[PDB]
């Protein structure tokens, strides 16, 4: 019935979009804000920010196609293809007004085409904790002076012959805990209950595969964004990144500067990759302030 | 016996600083030691060995923990494993210097021996891996061609037995996938050859030992930063595959910062597993390099 607890005042619902049944969680009143999660998680990573934004906004947090309780995409997993589903879902609830977009990890990959091709539909934009797919991702290190890299999963997930599925099947909880904790600075926030909920969700066979198909389409997304990036982004933009172990550090804003004309960036000390859960208070504060100012 | 011993060779053991090492020996004359790499054993040299034995005494040991060798008692860093390998070679050539041929992590486990005992090393052949130094931190996590060839560095080095946990029950699947994805000539890896390699490294202590070499890599980097203060002086050859899966120009490019007397070859259409993918041209280049002026 429900993989994750729905926050008070919110609603778990579905919408078919281009043949694909998307799951989403919606609440609040006012202009629309869409929150798009990343790999290893679902809409539920936003469950602490959602009631705060609901005080001024209509908040929708969908499950990415194939992840959570959304159906796999029927077109493909490249950024341009998935962005079609997400734009249509957001535009269905705010057809006359521009909306706000907050995105985390591969949520960036799956929305950037939508933003650059429909700038007038995007009022303000918040991107956190992942690169936009472009040639700069080819410079991430396979190995570092501190041991295992934070990005080796890019090639692991993208390997042919279903390597990752074959190796991870039957070990979904073990792998996800290793992936989450190795990208976290504050691992304390991931209780047994939270790790179980995420692991059970992405362990669904079609979800395990869908997770990696996003990475197998990464080269295709890079090529698409090389053409789309000819138009700079014009809406107000904020970037967030973890400054502790596991985060993007300075790279998040540095890359965004080549995309956005109007961008401010923050690096949150002692925080890793999973900002909404590791550093709920500072991150919620920065997002709420950015989207409230002048309104 | 895990792998068939070539006619005229013997499978034997020697104990070195408490660790019982396996090896295969044959021929007469000056000593050549052939050091294998990850995913394999001495047996990758079984085509070059009978050729070399016509002029040389050939010894191909199994790395500590791999094949039929016992795990090291000190550690898996380059300096630690080189002690076992240096003392083993000097047991068979205590009075004369010998030649060293090494492939993949065989380079990691012999370079400290070479730099500190140059008078013991007549000629040096290194193929298909970097010497552990800061350059390895520049390998790409992901490429314009898809999955990189080097991401296993971090996979193997991850904490909490990640690689062991995920590969357990899939040793043959993973090893076939790792080998073929690093090879240009996948046909030479028959069902029978893959089965022998998979059987060997699927031993619990061998699966772990395989990854411990990578878990010691940062320490090897720290060790080699000091050792490299002394350049290598003996004649040196490097070999690399120019096909999919190989080191390309980087093999010789890096060695130039280590050796004063080095020549390099990049073999077209060949991947990482030069002795098996491209036996004929590799064998010929090696035999010639160790035969000149002799």
């Amino acid at each position: 019935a429900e993989e994750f607890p729905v926050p008070n005042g919110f609603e778990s619902a579905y919408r078919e979009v281009d043949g694909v049944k998307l799951h989403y969680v919606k609440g609040g009143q006012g202009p629309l804000v869409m929150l798009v999660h990343g790999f290893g998680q679902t809409w539920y990573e936003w469950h602490q920010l959602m009631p705060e934004l609901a005080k001024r906004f209509t908040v929708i947090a969908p499950d990415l196609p194939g992840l959570g309780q959304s159906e796999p995409p029927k077109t493909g997993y490249s950024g341009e293809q998935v962005a079609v589903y997400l734009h249509k879902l957001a535009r269905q609830f705010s057809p006359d007004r521009p909306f706000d977009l907050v995105a985390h990890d591969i949520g960036i990959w799956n929305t950037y085409p939508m933003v650059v091709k429909n700038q007038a539909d995007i009022a303000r934009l918040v991107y956190m904790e992942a690169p936009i797919p472009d040639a700069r991702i080819y410079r991430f290190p396979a190995f570092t002076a501190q041991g295992e890299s934070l990005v080796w999963h890019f090639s692991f997930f993208a390997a042919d012959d279903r390597l990752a599925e074959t190796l991870i099947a039957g070990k979904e909880r073990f792998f996800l805990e290793h992936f989450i904790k190795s990208h976290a600075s504050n691992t304390e926030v991931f209780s047994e209950r939270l790790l179980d909920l995420y692991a059970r969700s992405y362990a669904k066979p079609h979800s395990l595969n869908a997770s990696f198909e996003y990475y197998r389409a990464l080269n295709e997304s890079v090529r698409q964004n090389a053409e789309l990036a000819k138009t700079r982004l014009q809406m107000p933009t904020m970037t967030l990144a973890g400054g502790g172990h596991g985060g993007m550090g300075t790279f998040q804003l540095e890359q965004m500067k080549a995309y956005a004309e109007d961008v401010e960036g923050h690096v949150l000390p002692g925080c890793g990759h999973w900002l909404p859960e590791e550093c709920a208070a500072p991150m919620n504060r920065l997002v709420i302030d950015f989207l409230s100012r002048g309104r | 016996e895990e792998f068939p011993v070539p006619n005229g060779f013997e499978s034997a053991y020697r104990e070195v600083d408490g660790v019982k090492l396996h090896y295969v020996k044959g021929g007469q004359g000056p000593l050549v030691m052939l050091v294998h790499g990850f995913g394999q054993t001495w047996y990758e040299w079984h085509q070059l060995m009978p050729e070399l034995a016509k002029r040389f005494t050939v010894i191909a040991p199994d790395l500590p923990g791999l094949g039929q060798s016992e795990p090291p008692k000190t550690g898996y860093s380059g300096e630690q494993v080189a002690v076992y390998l240096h003392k083993l070679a000097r047991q068979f050539s205590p009075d004369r210097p010998f030649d060293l041929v090494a492939h993949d992590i065989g380079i990691w486990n012999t370079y400290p021996m070479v730099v500190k005992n140059q008078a013991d090393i007549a000629r040096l052949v290194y193929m298909e891996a970097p010497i552990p130094d800061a350059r390895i931190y520049r390998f790409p996590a992901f490429t314009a061609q898809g999955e990189s060839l080097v991401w296993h560095f971090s996979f193997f080095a991850a904490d909490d037995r990640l690689a062991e946990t995920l590969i357990a029950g899939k040793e043959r699947f993973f090893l076939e996938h790792f080998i073929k994805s690093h090879a240009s000539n996948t046909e030479v890896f028959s069902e029978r050859l893959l089965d022998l390699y998979a059987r060997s490294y699927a031993k619990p202590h061998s699966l772990n030992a395989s990854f411990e070499y990578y878990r010691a890599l940062n320490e090897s980097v720290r060790q080699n930063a000091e050792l490299a203060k002394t350049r290598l002086q003996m004649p040196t050859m490097t070999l690399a595959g120019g096909g999919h899966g190989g080191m390309g120009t980087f093999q010789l490019e890096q060695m130039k910062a280590y050796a004063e007397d080095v020549e390099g070859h990049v073999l077209p259409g060949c991947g990482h597993w030069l002795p098996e993918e491209c036996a004929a041209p590799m064998n010929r280049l090696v035999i010639d390099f160790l035969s000149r002026g002799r």
Partner: nanobody, 120 residues
Framework: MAQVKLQESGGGLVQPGGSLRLSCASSVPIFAITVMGWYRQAPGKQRELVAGIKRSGDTNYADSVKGRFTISRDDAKNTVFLQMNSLTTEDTAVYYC?????????????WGQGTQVTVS
């Protein structure tokens, strides 16, 4: 040296609606090549990717040619083929064979000499 040499066959002049099959052979076994691809460049325009095929067998195509062009791999002939169906004047360009070989530090690009394709 050069780690691969590429030799194209095919091309020429064809009428709208017609077909052509391009060919690219590799000096090394084609399995040693990570990505085989076809690019095209018309005068005064940018070089663009048309089709690519990986060792796995996965193919990818440009939007303007999806459904009309087909890239395929003949391991015995060490050859990659580009079947070009339903040609329009908008497909007129010089078509280049492309080989990408991945090494540990990264890939190396190799290009063929190119063949002229004119649709008129």
């Amino acid at each position: 040296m050069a780690q691969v040499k590429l030799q194209e066959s095919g091309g020429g002049l064809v009428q709208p609606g017609g077909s052509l099959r391009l060919s690219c052979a590799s000096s090394v076994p084609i399995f040693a090549i990570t990505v085989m691809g076809w690019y095209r460049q018309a005068p005064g325009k940018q070089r663009e990717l048309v089709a690519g095929i990986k060792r796995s067998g996965d193919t990818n195509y440009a939007d303007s040619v999806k459904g009309r062009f087909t890239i395929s791999r003949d391991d015995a002939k060490n050859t990659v083929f580009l079947q070009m169906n339903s040609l329009t004047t908008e497909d007129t360009a010089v078509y280049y064979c492309n080989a990408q070989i991945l090494s540990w530090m990264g890939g190396t690009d190799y290009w063929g000499q190119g063949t002229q394709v004119t649709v008129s």
